[PDB]
Homo-oligomer: A and B are copies of this chain.
Amino acid sequence: MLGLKTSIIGRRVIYFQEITSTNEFAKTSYLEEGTVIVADKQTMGHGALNKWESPEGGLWLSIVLSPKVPQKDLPKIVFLGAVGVVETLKEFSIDGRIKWPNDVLVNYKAIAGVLVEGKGDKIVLGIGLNVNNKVPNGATSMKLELGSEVPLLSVFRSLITNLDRLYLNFLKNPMDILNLVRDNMILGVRVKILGDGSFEGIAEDIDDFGRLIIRLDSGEVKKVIYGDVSLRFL
C-alpha cells in the first residue's frame, strides 16, 4: 500500500513499532536484497564504537545489500548512506554536510549517522536520522532546523528513493560516490584523530579509497582508514 517505485531498495519493507536494533535484525535474518528494516523506536540502537538514541519521531532504518562489485569497493557503502541523507535534507531545504566518514551535520550539529555492518556476504546499511524526535545535547533534527514537525513517511520516501538511485549507479560506476562525498564533506579545517598514535592536522580531502588525507603541521601526510575512526574538529 506504500506504492514504492524503487528498483532494488524498498522492494520489501519490514516495519516494527519497536525493535532492539534494525541493524541487528537485518544481520541475523534472511532477507532479500533491497529489504528495508524500519522501526518507530529502537531500544538498543548503536553505531560506530560501542548508544544511538532512537526515540519515537526519528527515522531509524537498515537496508540489506549484497553488491556484486569488486572487493575493494565494498567499503564505500557507508558513503551511499551519508550522501543519500544529504540529498534528502536538501529536498527539505536543509544544508547537511558530511563529517567523514559517516555523520551528517547541519551548522556543525549532528543530525544523522550511518553504520555499516556485515553478516556473511550480506552488507547492512544502517541510517539514523533525527526528524521530529528529541535529540542529545548539541545535536539537531529536521524539526529543530525547520521549526515545525516534518511528515516522517515523506522523509522515508525521499531517502529510499535517493538511496535506490545512488545504489544502482554504484553497482555500475562504484567510483562516482567518492566525488559526491568530496563535494559534500567538511574539508579545509583542523581535526584530531583520537587513540593510539593520536595526531592533528588539516583535513585536506579523501583519496580514491575514501581515506581521509590529513596534512600535519610538520608537512607529513597521513591517510586515515574509516573502519572505526574517532575524529574531532578543532
Interface flag for A49 (CB, 8 Å): no
Contact of A17 among B11, B152, B153 (CB under 8 A): B11
Interface string of A105-135 (1 = CB under 8 A from B): 0000000000000000000000000000000
Which single residue of chain B is at the shortest CB-CB distance from A5? B17
Scoring A residues 12 to 25 as 1 if CB is less than 8 Å from chain B, else 0, what string do you get?
11111100000000
Instruction: Find out whether the CB atom of B4 lies under 8 angstroms from the CB atom of A17.
Output: yes
A40 interface residue per 8 A CB criterion: yes
User: Please, which residues of chain B bring their CB within 8 A of the CB of A13?
Assistant: 14-15
Chain B residues with Cβ below 8 Å from A155 are 1
Say which size band chain A's interface belongs to.
20 to 34
Q: When the two chains form their complex, are residues B3 and A56 in contact, meaning their CB atoms are under 8 A apart?
A: yes
Q: How far, in angstroms, from A17 to B8 measured CA to CA in the complex?
A: 10
Interface string of A148-169 (1 = CB under 8 A from B): 0000110110000000000000
The yes or no answer to A59 lying at the interface (CB within 8 A) is: yes
Asked if B14 and A14 make an inter-chain contact with CB atoms under 8 angstroms apart, the answer reads yes
Complex CA–CA separation, A59 to B38 (angstroms)? 21
C-alpha gap A38/B1 in the complex (Å): 7
Evaluate contact between B16 and A12: CB separation under 8 angstroms: yes
Give the distance in Å from the alpha carbon of A152 to the alpha carbon of B153 in the complex: 13
Q: How far is the CA of A12 from the CA of B14 in the complex (A)?
A: 7
- Cβ of A131 to closest chain B Cβ, rounded Å: 9
Q: List the B residue with the shortest CB-CB distance to A16.
A: B12
Q: How far is the CA of A66 from the CA of B153 in the complex (A)?
A: 30
Provide the bound-state CA to CA distance between A2 and B181, in Å. Answer: 30
Q: Is A101 in the interface zone, CB < 8 Å from B?
A: no
A81 within 8 A of B: no
CB-based contact B3/A12 at 8 Å:
no
Contacts of A153 in B (CB 8 A): 1-2, 153
Tell me if A61 counts as interface (CB < 8 A to partner B). yes
Output the nearest chain B residue to A59 by Cβ-Cβ distance.
B1
**Identity of the chain B residue whose Cβ is nearest the Cβ of A57 in the assembled complex:** B3
The yes or no answer to A10 lying at the interface (CB within 8 A) is yes
**Docked CA distance A61–B1 (Å):** 9
- Distance in Å from the Cβ of A120 to the closest Cβ of chain B? 19
Question: What separation, in Å, do the CA atoms of A61 and B5 have in the docked complex?
Answer: 19
> Which residue of the partner chain, among B2, B3, B16, contacts A11 with CB atoms under 8 Å?
B16
